[PDB]
Amino acid sequence: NLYFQSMKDSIKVFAPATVANVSCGFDVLGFAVDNPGDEVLLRLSDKKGVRITSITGDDGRLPKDAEKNTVSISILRYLETLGIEQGIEIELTKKMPLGSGLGSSAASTVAGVYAINQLLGNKMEVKDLLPFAMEGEFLACGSAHADNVAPCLYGGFVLVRSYDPLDVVKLPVPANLYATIIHPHVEVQTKDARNILPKQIALSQAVAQWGNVGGLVAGLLMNDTSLIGRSMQDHIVEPARSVLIPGFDDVKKAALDAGALGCSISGSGPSIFALSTSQEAAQKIGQAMKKGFDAINIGSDVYVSTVNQQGPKVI
Amino acid sequence: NLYFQSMKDSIKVFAPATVANVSCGFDVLGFAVDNPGDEVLLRLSDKKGVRITSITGDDGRLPKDAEKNTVSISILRYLETLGIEQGIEIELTKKMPLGSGLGSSAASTVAGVYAINQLLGNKMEVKDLLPFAMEGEFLACGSAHADNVAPCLYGGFVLVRSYDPLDVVKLPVPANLYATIIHPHVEVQTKDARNILPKQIALSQAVAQWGNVGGLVAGLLMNDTSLIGRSMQDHIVEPARSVLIPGFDDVKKAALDAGALGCSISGSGPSIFALSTSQEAAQKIGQAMKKGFDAINIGSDVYVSTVNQQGPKVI
């Protein structure tokens, strides 16, 4: 005795940028922010196949071929799993720069999967879309990051406890916790940010790090601020990668002098994030980081928000 | 308009065994149990100096010389810090075996420091006794373990977020969480358990581990059981040390088949602990571990308790 149906034959979804690693939690912590993000539009087609109609905000850098593109691969797999024969056209709009360290590929992929699922009448739980977004990323870029993908899809702050099997845990965070993201207008390759990591690390360095990861998780779950500040030390990854990011040391120091809880590389960079406990503090942190990059003549965009609990959004 | 004074010129304190490492949290997680533990008796003396009168349960293995013994060093330092000239005799009773992986040296040291502080009228906060217990351990055994000492002194379950500076965090744990400890009657050296650890580990192994440490901390703070089970995997330390512990693999398997949440080496071994969610489960886990060591003709003692929130205790 209820009927709902949608007459829409198209849908537009927005999916948010995410900050991965979050200082000491390399490969295991990530959270979503409000901006920026990507948009995906899907229309139903009587003509078969998943096809890419158009890509914008791209500089023609992304694969137009459907079997090479992350979004089309994801959607194709979803349709195959459910045994649906349905034509789909995709228009993709990048509202964020690629290789920025902000989970760009993830946002597109999550946008597509979320989109297809809602458009075809919510046949799967949002929870269960994660693997498709993962396989999509894996098949396209040879490499999937759950600490980008999970918070992007689920919203909020996430611990990726294991990759195999995929074990993801959403954590509460204090409501007055703000993230300032600065994205410099320069491109550090993801490739060089991977290669530069050590293959081996000292046990005592690892212990120092997993102490901190525990300190950070406890600090968030318990709404304690002072513990988070002290726990946001990264002794392994940031010292290796920071050489790739122009002005990193000055920018970090400027954020800490402006009163940040802590500050590190976002994902694989060159973006940098800082945490603070109010929107006055977050803004002046953003202003001081901007002033760091300006002093070396590098253009920059600043974003300020609390953790985005929504995740993707129909627009 | 209040007077309290104690006429006692002696005091006896008991301090509990602790379980360090707790699976994946090598050097950073530890918790206290009810039994076993050590006892320290202190008397005031008109004759000067801190002196050891007697040691029991020892096999004469412990240093009788006051400048070589962990308990007397600790107490001497405490007295010096506060600028007190007071003679003290110490009688020490080991109610637990040495090098058992149960924080034996820690218990003695914590017992002494707690004792002296209460006996001389509580001049310091319990909180502030930790460094003295640390310096004591360091000067005597050349090596101090906060993940034994802190939970011993403070009670409960502890995260040691950093050693320098010393950053300790007490965490809540579910009230129905039980620990079964089995101590085999065989001695694995602490020396060989240190030397056998890798000096270097792969980054991907470290990541796997700090994911787990986060998974465990979140699991305890959130009273989730299933997450703790999955988070208690140690891919670095236990595989290296378990060769030193006779029957380890069979004993672990027997605990897991009896329904343990998880099971690993306690501190540096040869003791083994398992976690479960009821006192029926903890007991049958204990029985199955005992049966593992009996089958290789090694004597064993089993202890079962919830996490000891009290810490030291005047007796």
The sheet with strand A262-265 has its strands ordered as A262-265, A272-276, A178-184, A300-306
Contact B211 A160 (CB under 8 A): yes
Report which secondary-structure segment, H or E, holds A79: helix A70-81
CA separation (Å) from B197 to A2, A167, B247?
64, 28, 19
Residues of A in contact with B25 (CB under 8 A): 210, 214
Contact A207 B161 (CB under 8 A): no
Closest CA of chain A from B96, distance in Å: 28
User: CA B115 to CA B135: how far, in whole Å?
Assistant: 16
DSSP codes, chain B: --------SEEEEEEEEEEESTTT-TTTEEEEEEEEEEEEEEEEESS-SEEEEEEESSTT-S--STTT-HHHHHHHHHHHHTT---EEEEEEEE-S-TTSSS-HHHHHHHHHHHHHHHHTT--S-GGGGHHHHHHHHHHHHS---HHHHHHHHH-SEEEEEETTTTEEEEE---TT-EEEEEEESS---HHHHHHTS-SEEEHHHHHHHHHHHHHHHHHHHTT-HHHHHHH---SSHHHHHGGGSTTHHHHHHHHHHTT-SEEEE-TTSS-EEEEESSHHHHHHHHHHHHHHHHTTT--EEEEEEE--SS-SEE-
- If one counts every other C-beta atom within 10 angstroms of the C-beta of residue A310, the result is 12
Q: Which member of B39, B137, B180, B238 is catalytic?
A: B137
Q: Is A25 on the interface with B (CB under 8 A)?
A: yes
Mutate to test the interface with A, among B203, B221, B222, B268 (most CBs of A within 10 A): B203
Q: Which of B140, B177, B149, B199 is nearest to B30 (CA)?
A: B149
End-to-end, the C-alpha distance of chain A in Å comes to 29
Report which secondary-structure segment, H or E, holds A211: helix A203-221
Chain A from 102 to 121: CB within 8 A of any B CB: none
Contact A210 B207 (CB under 8 A): no
- Bridge partners (DSSP) of residue A10 are A43
CA separation (Å) from A250 to A230, A244, A255, B209?
20, 14, 9, 32
Nearest to B230 among A24, A167, A197 (CB): A167
Mutate to test the interface with B, among A24, A209, A210, A224 (most CBs of B within 10 A): A210
In units of Å, what resolution does this entry have? 2.6
- If one counts every other C-beta atom within 10 angstroms of the C-beta of residue B53, the result is 14
User: CA B92 to CA B104: how far, in whole Å?
Assistant: 12
User: CA A170 to CA A220: how far, in whole Å?
Assistant: 11
Region B1-171+307-315: CATH code:
3.30.230.10
Q: Is A167 on the interface with B (CB under 8 A)?
A: yes
Contact A25 B202 (CB under 8 A): no
Q: Which CATH number fits domain B172-306: 3.40.1350.10, 3.30.43.10, 2.60.40.10, 3.30.70.890?
A: 3.30.70.890
CA separation (Å) from B293 to A85, B33, B187, B265?
61, 22, 14, 14
Strands B10-20 and B29-45: antiparallel
Q: Which of B69, B238, B197 is nearest to B140 (CA)?
A: B69
Q: Which of A24, A13, A15, A2 is nearest to A212 (CA)?
A: A24
Q: Is A169 on the interface with B (CB under 8 A)?
A: yes
Same CATH fold assignment for domains A1-171+307-315 and A172-306: no
User: CA B46 to CA A149: how far, in whole Å?
Assistant: 70
Closest CA of chain A from B91, distance in Å: 37
Contact A206 B211 (CB under 8 A): no
Closest CA of chain B from A273, distance in Å: 21
Backbone breaks in chain A (C–N > 2.5 Å) follow which residues? none
Closest CA of chain A from B214, distance in Å: 5
End-to-end, the C-alpha distance of chain B in Å comes to 29
Q: Which of A198, A207, A265 is nearest to A232 (CA)?
A: A265
Residue pair B140/B66 in contact (Cβ under 8 Å)? The answer is no
Closest CA of chain A from B286, distance in Å: 29
Q: Is A222 on the interface with B (CB under 8 A)?
A: yes
| Residue in the block written with tokens 């744990």 | B173
Q: Which residues of A are catalytic?
A: 137, 190
Q: Which residue of B has its CA nearest to A27?
A: B207
- If one counts every other C-beta atom within 10 angstroms of the C-beta of residue A39, the result is 22
Provide the token pair at A302. 């600043």
Strands A87-94 and A50-56: parallel
Q: Which residue of A has its CA nearest to B214?
A: A214
Residues of B in contact with A208 (CB under 8 A): 162
Domain spans of chain B, in order of start: 1-171+307-315, 172-306
Contact A202 B207 (CB under 8 A): no
Q: Which of A95, A246, A255 is nearest to A178 (CA)?
A: A255
